[model samples]
Target chain A: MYIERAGDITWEKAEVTGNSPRLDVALDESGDFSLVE
Target chain B: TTDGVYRVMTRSTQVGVGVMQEGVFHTMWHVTKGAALRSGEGRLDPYWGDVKQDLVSYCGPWKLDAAWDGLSEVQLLAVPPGERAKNIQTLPGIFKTKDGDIGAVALDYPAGTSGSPILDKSGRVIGLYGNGVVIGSYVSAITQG
Candidate 1:
């Protein structure tokens, strides 16, 4: 059935994939502010 | 106790659900794959997203009651087109389809809005609502395999 969750509103595009550069975001710990990749 | 709906989320993004079984969970892999992959070891969290107070936590398991194991007729429950934020509401009436077929009255739901439960009058889950204009699959289909 439809399970609800918080809307994906705050995710800002944080990176681009190889070559084609598709948009991507980091899945980091809650408040770990340093960029790993 | 009332059964809770479960969701698969990576960090803060939500994916879709498996068609009809508790063990089945899916989302649009194209969009959610990034987050799912980046989550690494933990990857994603499968929890009851519909619970109050806390937004993330495990609820429990779901088992199809014997009463609903094999049924040809059942009711559909879902949030109306513009009413996603609201609670799950019935479409209009019971579906009139025969076994293993789409009901004539089944309405087409929005894209990516798949996976609602098909329940009998007594509140037992009989099937799942899926991509087409009807129940996803028969309860037998889910349990047999």
Candidate 2:
């Protein structure tokens, strides 16, 4: 499962797998997603 | 089960979680205190009544993932105001004060981002990031170290 910031302070689950999976989870130019699993 | 990282949050805020040290899940103490104070008997205005106890919830056990126990110098890996993933941003920082207190350089983390884990270069958690500094419970008093 993946989560992303959709709004200023809101978070939403990102589609992990699909034709057009929402992979833009980074919230800022300096921030990027880090996963351990 | 032992190879994942987890993010913990309350309804109104995000409290970062790290590995269980000595069988305890260490996060920011203020997050818990804030939640309790806002709703429990500690509420500022008793007449307002208990606001909402259900505001806080655990999202995922996620995984035990990785953690660093050594509390030497470290940096902070946190999700900033407009970011999602835990790796949204990082701030290089120190771990102790000249007065021998566990601390960090003041950086602007999001409102709900308190309790986030401060990590080392290898992604090991050394302390908890709170309001504007690293809290001083889990790692003990720096002067004593």
Candidate 3:
């Protein structure tokens, strides 16, 4: 609980893991196969 | 791979959120910059889908405040989905800083709440919603923490 000014975030102590994962659609629809040419 | 567009994905399940500026969607590099597509890392299955990165775009100041005033009105437009969803809802939220780590409490943690965005009264992205997160990694270690 510490906030006195801007750019004062403690980057070291913060526990940051990967954000939540949700099922989503792919980016591309075409050219699914035919890789490694 | 697809022209200059690199499909970034994370090796983790915890989803991350991103904001849109002009035309580019800004999020965690870890979210979009995976080892490879379909490499047991992405947010979606690209083999049989439109697989779009969160098609949402957040405007306003993304990188400005390192920390918001404690107990201040840290409004979050967190897309919690369904009940928490129905579009965007105003979250009755507030942040507490510990050793410079800005953590927002009273947030709606739905399915993909990890990727939620935290904004001030002015719609400025304060912290990247990690629990006890980072600044702006992509915009600051967002989408992850």
User: Could you estimate the TM-score for every candidate?
Assistant: 0.35, 0.39, 0.37
lDDT of 2 by residue, B1-145 (tens): 1222234444544444323332233334334532322212222211111112101222232222343333433444455444654442223333332222233434445545554455555555544554332223222111100
TM-score of chain A of each: 0.21, 0.19, 0.17
What range of 10 consecutive residues in model 3 chain B has the weakest lDDT sum?
A: B1-10
Clash numbers, per candidate: 0, 5, 24
Candidate 1 C-alpha lDDT tens digits along B28-143 = 22223323222223333444322111122222333443333333333444423334422232322222222332221133444333344445555555444442222252111111
**How large is the interface RMSD of each prediction?**
20.2, 16.7, 19.2
* Candidate 3 runs further than 4 Å off: A1-37, B1-16, B22-24, B28-66, B82-101, B132-145
Q: Which tens-of-lDDT digit does each residue in B1-120 have in candidate 3?
A: 011111222343334443333322333322333211232232221121111222222122233333555444444434432322122323222222222222334333543444345555
DockQ of 2: 0.03
Off by over 4 Å in 1: A1-37, B6-62, B65-73, B80-105, B131-145
Q: Which stretches of candidate 2 lie over 4 Å from their true place?
A: A1-37, B1-5, B11-23, B34-75, B80-82, B88-103, B133-145
**10 residues in a row with least lDDT, candidate 1 chain B:** B50-59
Give TM-score, chain B, model 2: 0.45
Q: Score the docking of each candidate (DockQ).
A: 0.03, 0.03, 0.02
